[PDB]
Amino acid sequence: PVYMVYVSQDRLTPSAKHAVAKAITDAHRGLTGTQHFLAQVNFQEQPAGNVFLGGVQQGGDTIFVHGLHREGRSADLKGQLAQRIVDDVSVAAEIDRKHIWVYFGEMPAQQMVQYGRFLPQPGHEGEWFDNLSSDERAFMETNVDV
Amino acid sequence: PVYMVYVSQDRLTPSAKHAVAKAITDAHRGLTGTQHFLAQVNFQEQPAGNVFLGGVQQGGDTIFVHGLHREGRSADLKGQLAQRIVDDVSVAAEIDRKHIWVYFGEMPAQQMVQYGRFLPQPGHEGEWFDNLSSDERAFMETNVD
Amino acid sequence: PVYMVYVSQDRLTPSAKHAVAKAITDAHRGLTGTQHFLAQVNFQEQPAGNVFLGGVQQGGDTIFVHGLHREGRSADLKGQLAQRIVDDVSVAAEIDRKHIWVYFGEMPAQQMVQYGRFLPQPGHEGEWFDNLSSDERAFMETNVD
Secondary structure, X not given: OEEEEXXXXXXXXXXXXXXXHHHHHHHHHHXXXXXXXXXXXXXXXXXXXXXXXXXXXXXXXXXXEEEEEEOOOOHHHHHHHHHHHHHHHHHHHOOOHHXXXXXXXXXXXXXXXXXXXXXXXXXXXXXXXXXXXXXXXXXXXXXXXX | OEEEEEEEOOOOOHHHHXXXXXXXXXXXXXXXXXXXXXXXXXEEEEOOOOEEEOOEEOOOOOEEEEEEEEOOOOHHHHHHHHHHHHHHHHHHOOOOHHHEEEEEEEEOHHHEXXXXXXXXXXXXXXXXXXXXXXXXXXXXXXXXX | OEEEEEEEOOOOOHHHHHHHHHHHHHHHHHHHOOOHHHOEEEEEEEOOOOEEEOOEEOOOOOEEEEEEEEOOOOHHHHHXXXXXXXXXXXXXXXXXXXXXXXXXXXXXXXXXXEOOEEOOOOOOHHHHHHXXXXXXXXXXXXXXX
16 A cells, blocks of 8 residues: 655654554555555644645645545455544644544555556455565565554 | 645635635535545645646646545536536645646545544435534534635 | 655655656556546655555555546456556666566546546546647647656
């Protein structure tokens, strides 16, 4: 997946960004089984005041998570995963849950590429990972934090 | 909804951003019935020259609106809403309509969270809001303009 | 289409951004027949360190291309197009392919506006273009490299 995380500039320190990315990545690995290194978290910072709710200019405490996933998972599991992102980002970013918005979009795995390779169907990551070259396996394995 | 609005740095002042956000938000409530406070407008600014059309580097006068919606509305209504966003953003941002691009993407409401809660289906916002806790209703209600 | 290209600040020079935009645009036109001027490439730069893979902070060498397309093309063609984007962006940016991520999303053409006009079905860009006003055609036509 790619989790695009929209936040205000200076809301999250480097350590807070790491914790938020860990929270999201752990949630995705834990509920889907997808290897850690296949989850990207991409922080998009803008100056505070660029977010409007109901036309009302917001401060720096809003977070929007746009998660981009492969088609193929149940609505039940997507709901658990969105809820766990809400709960765990709330803790990691020290932000009240009413400030957190999370949308998931899905596409066929056949039109998604990570590390220059087309993704497999959900749940077939082991088989796919074993038919990768040694060098590609090694590169992906460096992108794992517990 | 979340409307991601991609503009060049400095093309919209704070006042023009408020006007553009108000235009989009009024359009969305007016045509869908969704309460004002459920519409987010999220400005993403980049330096002039980061947009290319046909390979041609652009100035600061381009706008791309990526609207993210719940599934469930008609093509007719989505067309009227995209057109009204073109018309009203043209006036609010003082930009010619030919500079405006608008794409709508839809997801099941069941995978869409706002204010920490899952959204209802597109016509059920009234009863959904009523059955939120009082502190949640109060917090959403602070976001009306 | 709109190709949203997420890169680190300063990783691409203006020249490299032009090259990357031309690589993507030329790929899209060559494989789909869609005119040059209908393809937008929109660079979104953020400071290095804002990208995490598996929880590991990255340097400035990651690129994520989010292409937004009309519904109607085959999985075969979308696959060829994504592969050609990986290949041609790798050359244009001098970035190894392992750093390149590419996702395509699709929406109905009826909820898709470019140059203030609703798009036609894929393959029908010819008729559609011919029925635009002459001023609208002239404006579009300037966006060819």
